[PDB]
Amino acid sequence: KRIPRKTKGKSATAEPGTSNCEHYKARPGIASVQKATESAELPMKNNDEGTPDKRGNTKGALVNEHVEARDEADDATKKQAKDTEKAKAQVTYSDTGINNANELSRSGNVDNEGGSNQKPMSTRIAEATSAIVSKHP
Amino acid sequence: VLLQRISPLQIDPTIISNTMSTVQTLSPASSILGKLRPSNSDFS
């Protein structure tokens, strides 16, 4: 047969003993627990900040680690307010009594080398190799 | 949510509501009634 991809490539009579009559209904509710299981199936997403592309530049938002961690806590609290919809979140990820000043997320601010990433790595490499180019007379 | 759909246990505030009381003289049953807030039904 032929199976397509999902990603991108490189380039007598009836013997008795049955009758559809269906007298029993599901006591916990088969559709309800069905949709709950379908919501629970989902694999988690990844973060990708601090990981390079093909070229070498780390993709991600140009933001400090700790303030991105608190931003992500606030946004997960916002999605918590979405689910079981209210005006405010019941369970919360911000506004905890635990001091968490020493938390670091992943960002695009820090490269894989250990320096900063305000200037991209491909630009740095092209500039370093363009520093020494010699020409004709 | 999955454990909500599985679990046989269901939760009502009516046990508190009929157990406590019926109703500026701060009654302790009324105080814990307003503190527990049984009109809310949210158990995430």
**Numbered residues of chain B with Cβ closer than 8 Å to any chain A Cβ:** 1-2, 4-6, 42, 44
Residue A1, exposed/middle/buried by CB under 10 A (0-12, 13-18, 19+)?
Answer: exposed
Neighbour count for residue A89 (Cβ, 10 Å): 19
Q: Using a CB-CB distance cutoff of 8 angstroms, which residues of chain B are in contact with residue A90?
A: 42, 44
Structure method: cryo-EM
**From A33, which residue of chain B is nearest by alpha-carbon distance?**
B5
Q: Using a CB-CB distance cutoff of 8 angstroms, which residues of chain B are in contact with residue A32?
A: 5
Measured CA to CA, the distance from residue A124 to residue A111 in angstroms comes to 12
Q: Which residues pair with A58 in a beta bridge?
A: A52
- Name the resolution in angstroms: 3.4
Burial call B3-30: b when 16+ CB within 10 Å, e when fewer: eebeeeeeeeeeeeeeebeeeeeeeeee
Tell me which amino acid residue B14 is: T
User: A40 and B5: CB-CB below 8 Å?
Assistant: no
